[PDB]
Amino acid sequence: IDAVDASTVKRVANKYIYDKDIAISAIGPIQDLPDYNKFRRRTYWNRY
Amino acid sequence: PVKLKAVVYALSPFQQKIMTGLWKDLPEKIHHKVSENWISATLLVTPVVGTYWYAQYFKEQEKLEHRF
């Protein structure tokens, strides 16, 4: 646990989160929930 | 807001082929286009083509009649 520093978190997040496919499971009143494509775009920041 | 009861399954755009569907079941696509629209195409082409040919026939007869 102590070996997980700020640079380690960023490396792992880039391996697993950055521009990665996601799975979505929703139930109930979910018409206002954004579509898969919106959620997929929000996996990366184009300003960097 | 409309009350709705439904289950929707969707697949990621990066897990499917994008363009090969353009040339799939092409015979069915052509058959559907022809069979559903041949009356519509007839109603648009026939008055235009028929009127055009009649005018050319009229001009040809008028031109020949004025000759000596």
Coordinates of N, CA and C in Angstrom, one line a residue:
Chain A
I1 N 0.8 -1.2 0.0 CA 0.0 0.0 0.0 C 0.9 1.3 0.0
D2 N 1.9 1.2 0.8 CA 2.8 2.4 0.9 C 3.5 2.7 -0.4
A3 N 3.6 1.7 -1.3 CA 4.3 1.8 -2.6 C 3.4 2.5 -3.6
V4 N 2.2 2.8 -3.3 CA 1.3 3.4 -4.2 C 1.3 4.9 -3.9
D5 N 2.1 5.7 -4.7 CA 2.2 7.1 -4.6 C 1.4 7.8 -5.7
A6 N 1.5 9.1 -5.8 CA 0.8 9.8 -6.8 C 1.1 9.4 -8.2
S7 N 2.3 9.2 -8.5 CA 2.7 8.7 -9.9 C 2.2 7.3 -10.2
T8 N 2.2 6.5 -9.2 CA 1.6 5.1 -9.3 C 0.1 5.2 -9.7
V9 N -0.6 6.0 -9.0 CA -2.1 6.1 -9.3 C -2.3 6.6 -10.7
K10 N -1.6 7.6 -11.2 CA -1.7 8.1 -12.5 C -1.4 7.0 -13.6
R11 N -0.3 6.2 -13.3 CA 0.0 5.2 -14.3 C -1.1 4.1 -14.3
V12 N -1.6 3.7 -13.2 CA -2.7 2.7 -13.2 C -3.9 3.3 -13.8
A13 N -4.3 4.5 -13.5 CA -5.5 5.1 -14.1 C -5.3 5.2 -15.6
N14 N -4.1 5.5 -16.1 CA -3.9 5.5 -17.6 C -4.0 4.2 -18.2
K15 N -3.7 3.1 -17.4 CA -3.8 1.8 -18.0 C -5.3 1.3 -18.0
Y16 N -6.1 1.7 -17.0 CA -7.4 1.1 -16.8 C -8.6 2.0 -17.1
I17 N -8.4 3.3 -17.1 CA -9.5 4.3 -17.2 C -9.4 5.1 -18.5
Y18 N -8.2 5.6 -18.8 CA -8.0 6.6 -19.9 C -8.5 6.0 -21.2
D19 N -9.5 6.6 -21.8 CA -10.0 6.3 -23.1 C -10.3 4.8 -23.2
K20 N -11.0 4.3 -22.2 CA -11.3 2.8 -22.1 C -12.8 2.6 -22.2
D21 N -13.1 1.4 -22.7 CA -14.5 1.0 -22.8 C -15.1 0.8 -21.4
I22 N -16.4 1.1 -21.3 CA -17.1 0.9 -20.0 C -18.3 0.0 -20.2
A23 N -18.8 -0.5 -19.1 CA -20.0 -1.2 -19.0 C -21.0 -0.5 -18.1
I24 N -22.3 -0.4 -18.6 CA -23.3 0.4 -17.9 C -24.5 -0.5 -17.6
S25 N -25.0 -0.4 -16.4 CA -26.2 -1.1 -16.0 C -27.1 -0.1 -15.2
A26 N -28.2 0.2 -15.7 CA -29.1 1.2 -15.1 C -30.5 0.6 -15.1
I27 N -31.3 1.1 -14.0 CA -32.7 0.7 -13.8 C -33.4 1.8 -13.2
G28 N -34.7 1.9 -13.5 CA -35.5 2.9 -13.0 C -35.8 4.0 -14.0
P29 N -36.1 5.2 -13.5 CA -36.3 6.4 -14.4 C -35.0 6.9 -14.8
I30 N -34.5 6.5 -16.0 CA -33.2 6.7 -16.5 C -33.2 7.4 -17.9
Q31 N -34.2 8.1 -18.2 CA -34.2 8.8 -19.5 C -33.2 10.0 -19.6
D32 N -32.9 10.6 -18.4 CA -32.0 11.7 -18.4 C -30.5 11.2 -18.2
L33 N -30.3 9.9 -18.0 CA -29.0 9.3 -18.0 C -28.3 9.4 -19.3
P34 N -27.1 10.1 -19.4 CA -26.4 10.2 -20.7 C -26.2 8.9 -21.5
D35 N -26.1 8.9 -22.8 CA -25.9 7.7 -23.6 C -24.5 7.1 -23.5
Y36 N -24.3 5.9 -24.0 CA -23.0 5.3 -23.9 C -21.9 6.2 -24.5
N37 N -22.2 6.8 -25.6 CA -21.2 7.7 -26.3 C -20.7 8.9 -25.4
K38 N -21.7 9.5 -24.7 CA -21.3 10.6 -23.8 C -20.4 10.1 -22.7
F39 N -20.8 9.0 -22.1 CA -20.0 8.4 -21.0 C -18.6 8.0 -21.6
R40 N -18.5 7.5 -22.8 CA -17.3 7.1 -23.4 C -16.4 8.3 -23.7
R41 N -16.9 9.4 -24.1 CA -16.1 10.6 -24.3 C -15.5 11.1 -23.0
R42 N -16.3 11.0 -21.9 CA -15.9 11.5 -20.6 C -14.8 10.6 -20.0
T43 N -14.2 9.7 -20.8 CA -13.1 9.0 -20.2 C -11.7 9.6 -20.5
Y44 N -11.7 10.7 -21.2 CA -10.4 11.4 -21.5 C -10.7 12.9 -21.6
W45 N -9.7 13.7 -21.4 CA -9.8 15.2 -21.4 C -9.0 15.7 -22.6
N46 N -9.7 16.3 -23.5 CA -9.1 16.8 -24.7 C -8.3 18.1 -24.5
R47 N -8.4 18.7 -23.3 CA -7.6 19.9 -23.1 C -6.2 19.6 -22.7
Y48 N -5.8 18.3 -22.5 CA -4.4 17.9 -22.2 C -3.8 17.3 -23.4
Chain B
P1 N -43.1 14.7 -19.7 CA -42.4 13.4 -19.9 C -43.3 12.2 -20.0
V2 N -43.0 11.3 -21.0 CA -43.8 10.1 -21.2 C -43.3 9.0 -20.4
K3 N -44.2 8.3 -19.7 CA -43.9 7.1 -18.9 C -43.6 6.0 -19.8
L4 N -42.4 5.3 -19.6 CA -42.0 4.2 -20.6 C -41.5 3.0 -19.8
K5 N -41.9 1.8 -20.3 CA -41.4 0.5 -19.7 C -40.6 -0.2 -20.8
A6 N -39.3 -0.3 -20.7 CA -38.5 -0.9 -21.8 C -37.1 -1.4 -21.3
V7 N -36.5 -2.4 -22.0 CA -35.2 -2.9 -21.7 C -34.4 -2.8 -23.0
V8 N -33.2 -2.1 -22.9 CA -32.4 -1.8 -24.1 C -31.0 -2.3 -23.9
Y9 N -30.5 -3.1 -24.8 CA -29.2 -3.6 -24.8 C -28.4 -3.0 -25.9
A10 N -27.2 -2.4 -25.6 CA -26.4 -1.8 -26.6 C -25.0 -2.3 -26.5
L11 N -24.3 -2.2 -27.7 CA -22.9 -2.7 -27.8 C -22.0 -1.5 -28.1
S12 N -20.8 -1.6 -27.7 CA -19.9 -0.4 -27.9 C -19.6 -0.3 -29.4
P13 N -19.5 1.0 -29.8 CA -19.1 1.2 -31.3 C -17.8 0.6 -31.7
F14 N -16.9 0.4 -30.8 CA -15.6 -0.2 -31.1 C -15.6 -1.7 -31.0
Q15 N -16.7 -2.3 -30.8 CA -16.8 -3.8 -30.7 C -17.6 -4.4 -31.9
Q16 N -17.8 -3.6 -33.0 CA -18.6 -4.0 -34.1 C -18.0 -3.4 -35.4
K17 N -18.3 -4.1 -36.5 CA -17.8 -3.7 -37.8 C -18.7 -2.6 -38.3
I18 N -18.1 -1.6 -38.9 CA -18.7 -0.3 -39.2 C -19.3 -0.2 -40.6
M19 N -18.5 -0.7 -41.6 CA -18.8 -0.4 -43.0 C -19.4 -1.6 -43.7
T20 N -19.1 -2.8 -43.3 CA -19.5 -4.0 -44.1 C -21.0 -4.2 -44.2
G21 N -21.7 -3.5 -43.4 CA -23.2 -3.5 -43.5 C -23.7 -2.8 -44.7
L22 N -22.9 -2.0 -45.3 CA -23.4 -1.3 -46.5 C -23.7 -2.2 -47.7
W23 N -22.9 -3.2 -47.9 CA -23.1 -4.2 -48.9 C -23.6 -5.5 -48.5
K24 N -24.3 -5.6 -47.3 CA -24.9 -6.8 -46.9 C -26.4 -6.8 -47.4
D25 N -26.9 -8.0 -47.6 CA -28.2 -8.3 -48.2 C -28.6 -7.3 -49.3
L26 N -27.7 -7.1 -50.2 CA -27.9 -6.1 -51.3 C -29.1 -6.5 -52.2
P27 N -29.2 -7.8 -52.5 CA -30.4 -8.1 -53.3 C -31.7 -7.8 -52.6
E28 N -31.8 -8.0 -51.3 CA -33.0 -7.6 -50.6 C -33.2 -6.1 -50.6
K29 N -32.2 -5.4 -50.5 CA -32.3 -3.9 -50.5 C -32.8 -3.4 -51.8
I30 N -32.2 -4.0 -52.9 CA -32.7 -3.5 -54.3 C -34.1 -4.0 -54.5
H31 N -34.5 -5.2 -54.1 CA -35.9 -5.6 -54.3 C -36.8 -4.8 -53.5
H32 N -36.5 -4.4 -52.2 CA -37.4 -3.5 -51.5 C -37.5 -2.2 -52.1
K33 N -36.4 -1.6 -52.6 CA -36.5 -0.3 -53.2 C -37.3 -0.3 -54.5
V34 N -37.2 -1.3 -55.3 CA -37.9 -1.4 -56.6 C -39.4 -1.7 -56.4
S35 N -39.7 -2.7 -55.5 CA -41.0 -3.1 -55.4 C -41.9 -2.1 -54.7
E36 N -41.4 -1.3 -53.8 CA -42.2 -0.3 -53.1 C -42.3 1.0 -53.8
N37 N -41.4 1.3 -54.7 CA -41.4 2.6 -55.3 C -41.6 2.7 -56.9
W38 N -41.9 1.5 -57.5 CA -42.1 1.5 -58.9 C -43.3 2.4 -59.4
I39 N -44.3 2.4 -58.6 CA -45.5 3.3 -58.9 C -45.1 4.7 -58.8
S40 N -44.3 5.0 -57.7 CA -43.9 6.4 -57.5 C -42.9 6.9 -58.6
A41 N -42.0 6.0 -59.0 CA -41.1 6.4 -60.1 C -41.8 6.5 -61.4
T42 N -42.9 5.7 -61.6 CA -43.6 5.8 -62.8 C -44.4 7.1 -62.9
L43 N -45.0 7.5 -61.8 CA -45.8 8.7 -61.7 C -44.9 10.0 -61.9
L44 N -43.6 9.9 -61.7 CA -42.8 11.1 -61.9 C -42.1 11.1 -63.2
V45 N -41.7 9.9 -63.8 CA -41.0 9.9 -65.0 C -41.9 10.0 -66.2
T46 N -43.0 9.3 -66.2 CA -43.9 9.2 -67.4 C -44.4 10.6 -67.8
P47 N -45.0 11.4 -67.0 CA -45.5 12.7 -67.5 C -44.3 13.6 -68.0
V48 N -43.1 13.5 -67.4 CA -42.0 14.3 -67.9 C -41.5 13.8 -69.3
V49 N -41.3 12.5 -69.3 CA -40.8 11.9 -70.6 C -41.8 11.9 -71.7
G50 N -43.1 11.7 -71.3 CA -44.1 11.7 -72.4 C -44.4 13.1 -72.9
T51 N -44.4 14.1 -72.1 CA -44.5 15.5 -72.6 C -43.3 15.9 -73.4
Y52 N -42.1 15.5 -73.0 CA -40.9 15.9 -73.7 C -40.9 15.3 -75.1
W53 N -41.3 14.0 -75.3 CA -41.3 13.4 -76.6 C -42.4 13.9 -77.5
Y54 N -43.6 14.3 -76.9 CA -44.6 14.9 -77.7 C -44.2 16.2 -78.3
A55 N -43.5 17.0 -77.5 CA -43.1 18.3 -78.0 C -42.1 18.1 -79.1
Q56 N -41.2 17.2 -79.0 CA -40.2 16.9 -80.1 C -40.9 16.4 -81.3
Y57 N -41.9 15.5 -81.1 CA -42.7 15.1 -82.3 C -43.5 16.2 -82.9
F58 N -44.1 17.1 -82.1 CA -44.8 18.3 -82.6 C -43.8 19.2 -83.4
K59 N -42.6 19.4 -82.9 CA -41.7 20.3 -83.6 C -41.2 19.7 -84.9
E60 N -41.0 18.4 -84.9 CA -40.6 17.7 -86.2 C -41.6 17.8 -87.3
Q61 N -42.9 17.6 -86.9 CA -44.0 17.7 -87.9 C -44.2 19.1 -88.4
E62 N -44.1 20.1 -87.5 CA -44.2 21.5 -87.9 C -43.1 21.9 -88.8
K63 N -41.9 21.5 -88.5 CA -40.7 21.8 -89.3 C -40.8 21.3 -90.7
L64 N -41.3 20.0 -90.8 CA -41.3 19.4 -92.1 C -42.4 20.0 -93.0
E65 N -43.6 20.4 -92.3 CA -44.7 21.0 -93.1 C -44.4 22.3 -93.7
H66 N -43.5 23.1 -93.1 CA -43.2 24.4 -93.6 C -42.1 24.4 -94.7
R67 N -41.6 23.2 -95.0 CA -40.6 23.0 -96.1 C -41.2 23.1 -97.4
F68 N -40.4 23.2 -98.5 CA -40.9 23.2 -99.8 C -40.2 22.1 -100.6

